[PDB]
Amino acid sequence: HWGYGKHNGPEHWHKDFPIAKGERQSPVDIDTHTAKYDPSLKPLSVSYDQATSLRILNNGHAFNVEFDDSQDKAVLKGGPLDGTYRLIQFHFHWGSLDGQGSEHTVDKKKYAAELHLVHWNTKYGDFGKAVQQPDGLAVLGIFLKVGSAKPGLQKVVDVLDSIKTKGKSADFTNFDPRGLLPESLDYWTYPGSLTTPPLLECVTWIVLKEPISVSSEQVLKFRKLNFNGEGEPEELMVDNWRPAQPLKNRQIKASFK
Ligand SMILES: [Zn+2]
């Protein structure tokens, strides 16, 4: 099955998932000079005060912090979005070295990692239905650079020892995703896809301009995770990012000048 190795990584995905070569694939390089300031964009609204985290799961390609999305407790709206999108999970993509790991790039620069907060459009009633729609998801992307610690990430880092291998889950309640956000909500936005199979073209990407900084120890702990299940041969969960895909017939919009 698909993965990030030599024989099953991104360049192979198209064989099972032909949309890999589609017209609105993600991620992309964000050419900051070619992005268009868009005045019709409304302010972005991130309402996470009532978020209910439930669990953390190693799914064999990343770890997801999952939320209760059975009510409007943690929602994204505004910006380029019509309507209300509920937070279902967040996860990261990261590198084996600090010089790579992000999926999106900014003027070809790679960050050490990238946080994805995955939301679905409440008009479609659940995540499974939403991913089948062209406006089904909104993913808020935040770049991580290595420097000072991010205190708000530490609770995540500390539980990773409990979900080292594929299939492991652990209770993860009362985590506040507001501690992972940078000061500024300035963003680029464009229409794209899931960056993991099934690669469905259902995502409005909202990528924040301002990275968060995390410590070297914090990202090191990500790199101790395993793609494999317990008792299978150990392969460190690193470089779980898809490279930048062709922009094709798309223009990236910016909320700022
Ligand atoms: Zn992702």
CA angle 186–48–242, rounded 5-degree value = 60
Q: Identify whether the C-beta of residue 91 lies closer than 8 Å to the C-beta of residue 119.
A: no
Distance, CA 92 to ligand 1 centroid (Å)?
6
Enumerate the known binding-site residues.
Answer: 91, 93, 116, 195-196
Count, in order, helices (H) and strands (E) of the chain.
Answer: 3, 15
Distance, CA 240 to ligand 1 centroid (Å)?
9
The domain total for the chain is 1
Range of the domain at 126: 1-257
Q: How far apart are the C-alpha atoms of 98 and 208, rounded to whole Å? A: 19
The burial class, CB within 10 Å (0-12 / 13-18 / 19+), for 248 is exposed
Enumerate the known binding-site residues for substrate.
Answer: 195-196
Distance, CA 65 to ligand 1 centroid (Å)?
12
- Residues assigned a catalytic role: 61
- CATH code of the domain in which 20 resides: 3.10.200.10
Q: Identify whether the C-beta of residue 89 lies closer than 8 Å to the C-beta of residue 116.
A: no
Distance, CA 118 to ligand 1 centroid (Å)?
8
Indicate the resolution in Å: 1.7
Strand partners, 53: 67
Enumerate the known binding-site residues for Zn(2+).
Answer: 91, 93, 116
Shortest CA distance to 117 belongs to which of 150, 75, 148? 75
H/E stretch holding 157 reads helix 154-159
State the number of CA atoms in the 13 A half-sphere of 41 facing the CB. Answer: 22
Shortest CA distance to 217 belongs to which of 117, 111, 98? 98
CA angle 177–103–123, rounded 5-degree value = 55
